[model samples]
Target: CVRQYDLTDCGAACLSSIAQYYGLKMSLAKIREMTGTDTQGTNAYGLIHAAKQLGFSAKGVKASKEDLLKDFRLPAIANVIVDNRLAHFVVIYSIKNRIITVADPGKGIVRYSMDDFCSIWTGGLVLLEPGEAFQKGDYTQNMMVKFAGFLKPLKKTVLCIFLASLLYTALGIAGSFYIKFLFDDLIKFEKLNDLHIISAGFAVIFLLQIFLNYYRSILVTKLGMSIDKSIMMEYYSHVLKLPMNFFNSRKVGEIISRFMDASKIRQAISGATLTIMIDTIMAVIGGILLYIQNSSLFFISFIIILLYGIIVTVFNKPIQNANRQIMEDNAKLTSALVESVKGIETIKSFGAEEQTEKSTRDKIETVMKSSFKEGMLYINLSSLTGIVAGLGGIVILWAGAYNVIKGNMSGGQLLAFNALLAYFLTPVKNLIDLQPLIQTAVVASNRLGEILELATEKELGDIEFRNVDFRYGLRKPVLKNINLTIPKGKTVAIVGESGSGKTTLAKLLMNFYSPEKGDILINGHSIKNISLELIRKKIAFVSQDVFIFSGTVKENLCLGNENVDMDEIIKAAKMANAHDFIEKLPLKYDTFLNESGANLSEGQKQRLAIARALLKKPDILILDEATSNLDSITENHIKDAIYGLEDDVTVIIIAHRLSTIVNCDKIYLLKDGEIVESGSHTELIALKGCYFKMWKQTENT
Candidate 1:
């Protein structure tokens, strides 16, 4: 069951639960977006619209409880008034007897008598079922197979831990035998001297067991840390190599949470797996000892253990589902927290501090509810296991005592058998107890696999678009059929209003995405055949929003290219009109900059971005609205710096301001994702076409 993060999100939560039931895995945030849920909450029309958008045949109808059961589908959303005042939405799963079962967004799964439900019922409900176009989400089914690849490098460490565990298990079993001998033979026979010698020998065995356990713990820790480091490094490296679209589709905090899932996987593999193996060995040895004492008793004990296995297996699916829900809720909470902090200025500017705080609290409450539900599941499983263990022990003791009274067993033999039984059952319990941990790790592995399995961006190169068409997902095409080219060394500008595909054109050139139709060529070769690293190194793109890393001015300018010397750095900075600002700083070149250049103005950050791009000395430099947000004076300074680039370096300018590109050798005017006009400024003006009209508009502005 899904719960609402905010009070007003009841409609969204209900939709999310129904979507999941229909095999569509959707987060609450996504549901809210699709349903256009606002502060006031989602209305009936919004719910109908969102359901239909998700490929579900949906409609709202006025219906009574009996009508719901007889006419509408099961699991339909029903509107109700809480406390005779507030309205809410909930999924009506079914009705049996006089009880109506509902998955409540506010209170979770609940049952109400038919009469109680009728009082609050608004006689309104939304009926829904999957449409022909609906398809189930593809859950990660091969997480274990993918996770196994990470273990290949740790085989040696695993082997060592296994051997130590085996020795430990042997020592444990031997100790049980020692107890049997002490009670059944040594003590009864009055072999005092032999007992002392054997006691000393067992003492040494105890010490050896302690040492082996310590060693095994060290190996386990090492194995876990090794896997943690490997998974983290690989995950981080892969994230860096992913395409822009991947990052755009997810929130920063959500991605970081997935990155942290590695540690959980490490614990499950290193700790739980080892414990299960050791317990298995102990159980096997203990079973043999139990059977030797009395086969009938062993059979009875085996039946109890088999029951425990069945109970654990029955709980696995629910436990796994609960764990997945908790992880997802946690990720959503984290994402909300990060976004709130990042947009603090905006929140305060709009006087939304109280609203933001309340929203965050709601998210926390949601997370707490999910965790509580999962914890209860674990508690229930633990309680059931405890009852089984307690009853199993009582039955075994009764059966053993009966054998003794019947003269089939000696008193000492019964004592030893009981001790051995504990040894066996304890491990059996430990193995059963590991079910939750394993299930948690399974969920973690699947979350990690989602990103790890995606294909990374391939390296690409010369720029030519041949009738290329593009779109994001199933949205309308952002870029239509278009032909464009940039030669070895020339200055060219693409001028267009917002949403005209200018930025998308630049992204295509960078190979951030591939065209749905046609191809982009570089150096007369299809970009599909080129190396990403090679192409990226040869090109530099400076956009309007500049991201400055937290470091010294020099470090930020050079960006780890040690090959360039101080003179070269100073030269590039001078060319970009950024040297004067750097020199005026308190520590000059060594001065530190805040994250995202918070200490710098928008113009200053833009200049720094230009200086950094110039340091690369790229063969092709694309300035995408880099100076669009700066003041007129700053914009002019940046324009001069851009136009002053070496004659051999090609420059592609994407801008809205016509004045900035009037001096370019050639200009292309884009309209609705198509280049409608291209020519020298003088030629375009004389032609009196779309370019001419745009030039007049810019001049007037």
Candidate 2:
């Protein structure tokens, strides 16, 4: 079938085919609506969530063409890289008989060569099947294991919230029945003696309801805060431990936003989830009460409720799309504002204050316009619901009056029926208002799910590289077929010019990323077989840009290693040439550092970082441009300290300056990504090639 491609709706189109294959009824438009497919196409996270909601079990699997072919699931969706940039989706319908049936949203369905299909399938595939249908090697089992581990602790909170929800509904039912007595018995029966007793009963119930609601609110609030705290801490722990590539591929602010997304998830659970549950129960209970009052009026009320649900459903897509755009625009504006502030020195030096202000105003204007559009869409939906509700009220009153006239229901009972109508309609409106919150939770949960689902670093040991190669997302390969071996106790230096893949190589040693091809070994074992915590504990890395936290210097130095003594701290600082300046500070090691150590010079910051690394005394030390900030005297001191290290403590230093690494035990010269020369500094210079040329260039500079 021909597929629509006006927008990046490949995900929507592919899902439409998958649903059709399974005889599940969902239109392309509906899928797009649910997935929030826009000009950039539906995001993988959104598509995955939509698939689950549609009752299809789907998951992402990082695999090779050959790997996928081994346990191929028919009617699957794969992400393809078109022109090495644009991410497109295509359905994999068959793998048997070496025939590949691809349903492309841009080009329609076509039978393709297995080779041709594999050529563009650059990333993971999404396996789609009926919930009960299982394919061997499908990601479902693995996907569940980690998430299940994390959420099990929240099981008691789940039970508490569920119980509270029913109790809340019970209260609503009780109140509506109390209204019936107030109208039909207290007023109609009108004994003045009954009045005083009924008033006392109403007062007691009101106070009791207030007490329960107040305490219930506290329980939910505490639960939400605690949940947010735990989940965020866990997210942070996991994110910090993720492979280097996971962070390298994204922006700092984008990653930071996930923390807030976790909080949204917490709010969703405590605020939206139970509220939705209780309100739904209240709606159901109210409907029953209304039906008992008068059947004709109940039917009319039911029709109106259905109409309201339809109205909300039909307008949800446009409202959500507008909100999505607003959210993105706000993020851009936030990022821009943050960048401008962070780079204020540069902006002021360039005399670009006016320019930046103008730019900021443009973003502000864009945000205003986007929010206006979103607000208008929201208002339209709300107004339409209000109109439906108003008409429903009129219909209920008219039908109730007729019943009263027919003597089928008393005037007092008619008033009582209206009270139940109010109760039911309130929940309907609440559930409608709750749509955005629910969406927020779903979207945030999916994003958090993606991170949790990602493969984390394993414990790594002794290092080896056998034809290792890698690249950043959708970018050209940064490291070529690199092959090297560093024994457990060796000091090696990698020297290269800018963009020569020096730092990337150092990152590989840190296991920040896995090679796209070949294997990395630690000792006699593959690095992939090792656990991340084990690898990290044995390695300490000091990156080019030092990140200093806002805390006492001592706190920053030790991190979690509080058992370290003052003598050790002083020794590390002295070795890093940080001791002199730190001693001069008013509070010494007790001095409070500002965020990013803004009060300190760049060199000072670098020294503190070196000290931090030195304190670890790890089995492996990676210094990537570590000494670039030191002056001649301090630089020599650090170099001497490094040379004085124990023989068994392995060190890998990445540098551009030739003099710093001239005394390194072994030197490797990188041209682009490959090691063109490997030997002592003297041997490399004697060879008189790339290393020689770089040495002369650095000497002249």
Candidate 3:
């Protein structure tokens, strides 16, 4: 090890005496190993003595530089620390020699020399090993920041929005112009033929209203539905592409929230539909037309708009702030009450009903108060709009009357001018007093911003892992760095403990988790490079967790593929041992699933999932936890179908029970994030490690 001068003869190696046991991000349970109120190591000071005995050296380093060095320790990478106060170590990176750098690339202060940049580098153990290849992550604060790899549907959504908006705006301008004609011509109509057009004002208004509603509503619905589909398809596709790590800790509700939030409402507003009809197309074109008709009068109308804009600006900030506060309060209240209610059985079992009720009531009271304040702010916004509209109408009446009396404006002309002035009034009103609506968009945008910031999955390259390391969570890792190779055309069976990473290994082979550190290749490229669609197309996946969509069995089985082989479909069903059951049903394969295939048994559903994979005839066939729940008779049926696969299809079976893979190509034993043994079934038993223990124990049970 060398600084600038000492190229050799360093007393302590860089990796030895890791300063990992400093104040770490830990919970009360994790700190219990310590002796005093202050946390300490397992033996208080024994580990330090052991490291010194192992030829490691230690020195009193700066308290500030601890975070820079601790990241290299293995234990630090496993857990996540929201707060750094409990962290004892520092994380740092080095290029060569003794050049050390701190901070994770995606987060923390900019990486710099430990001595030069220690001032800004104040943080924790830099834990959450977060994999070798770093990527940005948004925990939900700024949702609209566009993450890479999200599907791009904005172009189509924008087009639909604009077209619908233009039509709506046109109707408003035309209505006002028509009103001007009736008001200006009333006197002549009364004399010429007793034309009392004023009496027909309501009828005209009704007919115009009907026409406007018909066209605009239809267009609006079309726009909304189109955007919905675009968003849905895009989301479905993008979500599938995300790595397994993202899905592990996620709840179903939060994923649903991303798809069903106020962002969609804002999409409705900002899209071409509203902007074109109400603001851009109508306002701009109509205002230009008004300007052409009477530049002087239009200028007077424009001055009034300026005044309205000022009033809107004055009130916008306050209403916006109040609405945001109310929404947060509402979110909190809903979260507390819903969690309590949903988990009421647990609460009752624990006899915490009184505490639960009190907490829920407290949340309710807080929400009630917040709602009242929100209501007050809303009322204020409406009052401001009404007051502005009233004052503007008075000013226009006075101006129009003066102009008419001076003979510079005919009754019709003055009336028309006033009408156009009123038409201009809507946007002016929106700009000034639509505080509630504007605030709605503000909240929606903020939510959208949060989603946008989430780091999207990267494209994986094709690189097969000979030995893979993996785990589901804090639980013992299913597969250690077990070396494996799924050749271009070969069937590989992964047989292990029921809780062993069998299905997990299959998922990894399918490029699911993006291993903490290992390799997975497709067509000699890293799996990340291949598109998820390509994987779906290339690999046939048969899982126990079969998702039967809401539709006829034939429809769900056929999915969206038109070129599906009817003969092959029947053959696949028979191969999955589903043909006998499906044939017995009235609709045969055409029977409806009716949401989650509610009509089918567990074995039947498993067979259906297998049938789907068979139909795919993919380059890679993965049978994940394939026979875990099937009966002995059903298992044999599925077993026959699995082995009946065409030799060309690279079949991979993830089996927990030993009987399923008596003739597998190879076996790899995984335990606690390390490979303990690897050999054939009889050979693994001979080695007598974790696999042998599991085998002997299962047999004994």
Candidate 4:
């Protein structure tokens, strides 16, 4: 049987199972799409459509219970109501005698009496038969197996907790027996001496129970924290290793919200695992004792607990759907807030503050509505379970009292049964309560799985674009087929207008993106064969849009260049024409800078970035419009600095200012995405082509 991940996708799950049986394998996601399954759930028409799409001869029809038992085909999808209120679907496997066996997506394999089945049966079902395209195959997607893999490392902890719970449960069972002895044996004999011994023994059992519980609590807490930390750390590290394109398509706040979902998984797994283990042991042993005390009452209590589970299961879909909605809405809401803060200056400058606020308010309203819906779902579940529990208690007491009157059970036995019943029922109740937590975690795990399944960029690279072609997604090519080379320790300029693919070339070299066609080589080695870390270490890029960390000037400059003394930092800054401003600061090299260097002017930030790049002492340096913000005098100084590095470093300058690149050994002017001209500045001027035009424009400006 295929299990549904999202609670509302039972129809998809059912279809997947039936399709598999017919020799067709289909994913729930694909089936859900074809069926138009939504939060409200998949309808009969949708399921039929999906079945037909999957090469099934499908038809929806109404039939009586007798029709199904006699001539109806096996394994047809049956639409029924749960609890006489909720609509549900199950696959009818077969009918033996008056018992109908079926596979339920929610409860798994279940056998129902004909009378009970008819009560919930809507007499509606979709008949499916294999078509020409259908081929029989067993298909299954077990999320639990993947989830259980995460718990493998905690096996020792789980074992210890189980052992401790066993002792705790035994001690609890002993206390019930102690109460039985007091009323049925000790009190009858008036054995005062025996009473003292029994009381002392009971005290020791209570103390032992307390200690074991405390120990178990500590274990559970430690397990929770460890799982949380390990998952978060692994997730963050993977995110960092992902390619730039991954970040390009996602919003920061949305990513963060998904990352935070790891904690929910941790809470559910760590906390509920321990509770369920303890409760299961208690329930099993206490159940035996209850049956021994009175078999009739045990049956009654069993029915009550079974009803509790059914109630919770019926509400699972609504609660889980609400939780998924809340998570999605909250992610959107967070993305809005983050964007507003990051673009605060733009908002005010454009007088779009009200627009931003309204957008954020709408998101907040959506989140509020989703959360409110989830809360109401939980409240309804709790209300129904509470009524059943209350009525169950009354029924048990009434039955036990009648048994006592009939002399089938003693007063002491009834009292002890009640005590034992708590051990049995409370755990059952606790396990039942864990349904919501598990549902929440299931949603969280699915969200996290989406990120984890994406392939991380391999730590390997080189810098060559041989007849390269690239684009963002399926858009038009950002860079067309082109070939270029930069000899070691030589400076080359790639001059182009905005959007002429200048920066893209640098990104390709850095391995931020792979070319759609062609290959990039660095130092006679294809980037694919070299470690990404090693390639990046040999190259430093200073982009036009600079980012500054919140730290001391010295600390920022020293990033990625560890063990550097102050003298080297000052030297690099001097080479980048940044030392003069650094010396003017209140603390000189020790002066603190805000995030993105908010305290620094555009030129100052550029200079700082340039200096940071210089500190790397890389084999190649890329300055992409790095001097755009500098004054003419500072620009010339930076240009002189670039000219001075010609013998020691291979520099690729992407600039619009013709004057800065006048002394370069060679220049390649780009129009659109292809190189249109390549020569010395004077040669380009002599040719009077695209480079000549650009030079004329630059000079006039």
Candidate 5:
């Protein structure tokens, strides 16, 4: 049983309710005494301490609905903001059907929807147990684990680089002292008699410093390039493996911006990270040397460094906003340029060159304005840092001279300290200069995280549609309650008008989207359970739009099956009637095609696409209006190739021309998201239904 409380008894009331759950007769007055709660209220720490002292295990953790579902057992104390202002505690005793039963001190026992509870949870949950405490999963810890996993493989390289940078920093500091010795011991002390000895010593130090500096430079370059390659390769690979729906939703240019962002992150880590560390070292070493030279002088310089930091921090928000705005505008510019390039031919055909120019100019102008604003931020920061740095040096030297005049410091040490200050302040200057880049890197990292967090596709089996219904977001049903069976090795064809869901059926079969209602099965295994790679690998798709990459003919043919032999290529080519034209090319199979196969005729490109698919020899091959561009004779040759493989392969062909599926084992006619009729060519014609009507129109045309 739960009970209400006055101002001071909320904590005591919560504990009493929790104790009641364990069959313990705990008094609210006694809990208040034990917890030392006054008029103000009892603290969570005091409550937890009291619970532990009274023979209970207690610990606090972040509260989330998903985590609560996992644990399920409770009599936990959770914190919520009362009336959206005051922080108050409540005992949560039970959860049932997404409704949490809370023992609110003021409200007594109450039920709250999980959302309502979570909305004001303050992310704080204290578990009080009669037994040993258990550890709960934490989100931040999980995120850090993934990030650490990326760096785990390169830990040794990172350590080596760290060690090398340390050695370089030490050498740099040593060089400054060496110059000090030349001024103090050699020149000032009339030590010309030992000039050769000191000169040789200086020469040795110089050469060694040069060697270490060169070695580290190599390592820096090597590490940066390697990280860039690794990140790019992994990101690109993961992106390609993502669900087809991802590509359907994202633009090509927007995706490429991620590639650039990845590069930015790489440079930030490899260059900016290393530089910042070394600069910090410089500041530390310089400050120590200055303090040893003169405490007053060091303090003055320290004040300047402090000012430098504040100035940089003051501009931090502005720099962050500018860099982020520039980055977003750049993505938009890239998308616009990509869109224009893809539709340039259409624009030219429509005689809209001036209109295209106007739109492109607008994009360019926005980018320029954003760039100018970002540049201004950089320039202002740089100018401020430079002015402060130069002025700080002069003021510090003047202050050091006053100490020297009072015989509190030597001229030699003062000069040496100034040189050391250069070592320190130079890095401070550089770091300030890199603030915008560092902030840009932080934003870029978040962008990359967005993509990497997406769920990837996993395995597949033989497919079936069991009363499937599907649609895109907010759109009318693309595929209605449709049931179909595709045996392991049987040919089937679906013919429909433009908006009749033929392509949507293909997309659903490929696991591009899941049905809102009904199921898609593979070998009686639901498609949702199947891996994307397995589903895609088991089928080869050739569409009306034949896409050829800019490469040699051999490269294009072997894209799906990289291990295919020359004999296999020729065989596939001959079947698709592409070998004759390919052989006539200047370099034969070695001939290079321009982007999108622009150099080749439409028929030639279609033939190559067919050949590419044929080379894969997948168990199931889908040709969606694939022969639309081929001449009648060439189409017949490809048909013969299809017939030859019918014994060993399952084929699905979608064509407007009835001739393409005349020999198909089964033909289904689809209209307005429904399969109206299905049969062989002769049977459909005899039935005189939709398929029969379509065929008659085709023959008449």
Candidate 6:
């Protein structure tokens, strides 16, 4: 679509004359009405004539000085438009009386009041640069098991991580070899001659062992992070793109905790490298050395190892089974503590802090009881075995020394014999001990898998909503099945009661949810066919629940839309009423925000939400109570943002404050999952239906 210019007096005249010369349908009377002005009687100039004198053209917010002076219009293409006031281009699909329905940039389906449009037109002359228009959020599963399904298809990052893991594996083996050298060479020489060689060798072995271990630790640490980033990105795209239903059904903390584990807790299993590869390899070399020293002693030790291995195996089924239950109880205890602390206000207000803590303590006690039962049996056996083995070692040493002195064994052979026995038993003891660690890894893997397997909603096809029926739950359906067409360029608003499905509708429009009943179309195709990542490229949402992560305002606003211009964000902040308060902040827009911008008041938070939304310059704008948080004056400013938006950007809002809706083209009432009524605020009040009653009650409230 060609960009439209403000009908500033002389600029309007120039465009109108140009329209006449080109045989367009626009005329002087239409020009005056469009510009909301009357330059009629004496000057007798049409709004278009005034526009010409003001240097207007059909290419930009205001024609350039050179363009107006030179009287030449620049080439026009459908470059995105962003300003608080007028949309550079507007495409109205339906209009009745003074009400008109149009699409707004970065918004979904909506209608606007004629007066609101006029107000926007009056102030539409300000220019804007490009900005970030996208949907984003924290990764959470709440309860969804298929959250990590996207990672299944991303093999590249997995391969990269696997390569990094090998580095850790290699260093672990080196440490094992150094430990073996200390036992075989150093201890053997100490038995034969002096302690000096043995002590020096022990010192050298200790240092080498530390270095190898340290090297492996660093590699594993870096490798884990790389894997986490790759794995978590899949979640980032998945949860952010899932339809509103997926989000609604889940808890915020659960999802965050799950992904955090996948990123950190699960990835940290690199420590297992020492157990799985190096220890196993050292076990092999140790067994060989022992057999070479005294095959008869090796046989006896083999029997003991076999017996120990069998004992663990027999206990495995029961232990593995109890392990899962224990972990669940543990996670529950952790979650309860977190929830109680985070929701302390409510808990304390309800006078349930002691009770909540008691409940957590009870769960933790159960975990401890079960853990002690299982662990005590193994711990006692291990202690008994260690005592028995030490006594047996003393007997074996005396027996070997007598044989050497009596000439039944060679002196060299006796030294080698002791070295081999030590090497063989060390790894065997470790292998025996590894039983529980392996079990924990298995359990962690299973829990992590639950999140990785959650089915995330992907907005495939095109991310578009059409005549969608939506709601958060059975508690009074928020949005009825109202048909809406969201094209590029205009602004719209959704106004309804506190529970009206304004935000629900926005989630659907942004392809955050798959409509329960009807199909949503994007670019003439159903949105269900396009991947969510593809769909979010064109949409951004700013809501009543303004979420500002712990970061600078600039970091939050631009997010990851690296292509956004900083100046555009500043303008949007000004338009949203955020810039004023931001300037007063310690660092202005550079100020930090945490937990939904809680540092700011309700109004300031709302403005930042608007600024972030505007920075995106989305094709469909969803003002889901984004302005509902503002005070009267501040509310006017946010409401003005819509009134002043482009005529083409589709806007949908669920407004709590009735004043904001009075200027909307149409108002939809949602009750029991159906649209009971829709029309201009006056027309709806005239009907005296649900919306009218709600409006009256709000006024009284």
TM-scores, all models, native as reference: 0.74, 0.72, 0.58, 0.74, 0.70, 0.59
RMSD of each: 7.1, 9.5, 13.4, 10.6, 14.9, 25.5
Clashes of each: 3, 8, 62, 9, 6, 69
Ten-residue segment with the worst summed lDDT in candidate 1? 454-463
**How many times do residue backbones clash in model 2?**
8
Give the winner by lDDT: 1 or 2: 1
Which of 2 and 4 is the better model by TM-score? 4
Report the alpha-carbon TM-score of model 1 versus the true structure: 0.74
Model 6 TM-score relative to the real fold: 0.59
Residues 407-489, candidate 4: write the lDDT tens digits.
89887888888888888888887888787777667656655655555567674222345777887543457778777766677
Pairs that collide in candidate 2 are 244-512, 458-530, 458-531, 458-532, 459-530, 459-531, 459-532, 462-522
Candidate 1 per-residue C-alpha lDDT over 95-195 given as tens digits, one digit per residue, 9 for 90 to 100 = 87788887777646778766778877777889888887656755435656655667776778888888988888778667656776787678889899989
Error of 5 at 453 (Å): 3.1
TM-score of 2: 0.72
lDDT of candidate 1 at residue 390, scale 0 to 100? 86
| Candidate 6 segments whose C-alpha is farther than 4 A from its true place | 1-285, 314-378, 398-407, 410-415, 431-500, 521-540, 560-567, 596-598, 646-648, 656-660, 685-701
Candidate 5: tens digits of C-alpha lDDT, residues 596-646: 553688887887777877887777787777666766755676766766685
Candidate 3 vs candidate 5: which has greater TM-score? 5
**RMSD in angstroms, candidate 4?**
10.6
* Candidate 3 total steric clashes: 62
Q: Tell me the lDDT of candidate 2.
A: 0.71
Q: Write the per-residue lDDT of candidate 3 for residues 406-446, one digit (tens) a residue.
A: 87676677666666765565665554454445455555544
lDDT of model 3 at residue 46? 27
lDDT per residue for candidate 6 within 1-701, as digits (tens), equals 11121212223333333333333334332343334332211012233333343344322344321222222222221111343222233333344556645443221224765555544432222221222321121222232223234334444544444444344333333333443344546565555544466556556665665665565556555655665786567656666644444344345654575566655544444344334555576678667766766666667667667766666666666655455556656766786788788999999899988898788889789889878866876676676666557666666667677766776666556655655555566667677767666555444444445334445553132234456765444233455576654334533445544454656666675666567677978668776776666557557777667666787877887875786776777778778766677788787667777765546687777676777667777666666655446567566775568555755566665666666566766666656555565467777788886766776777775
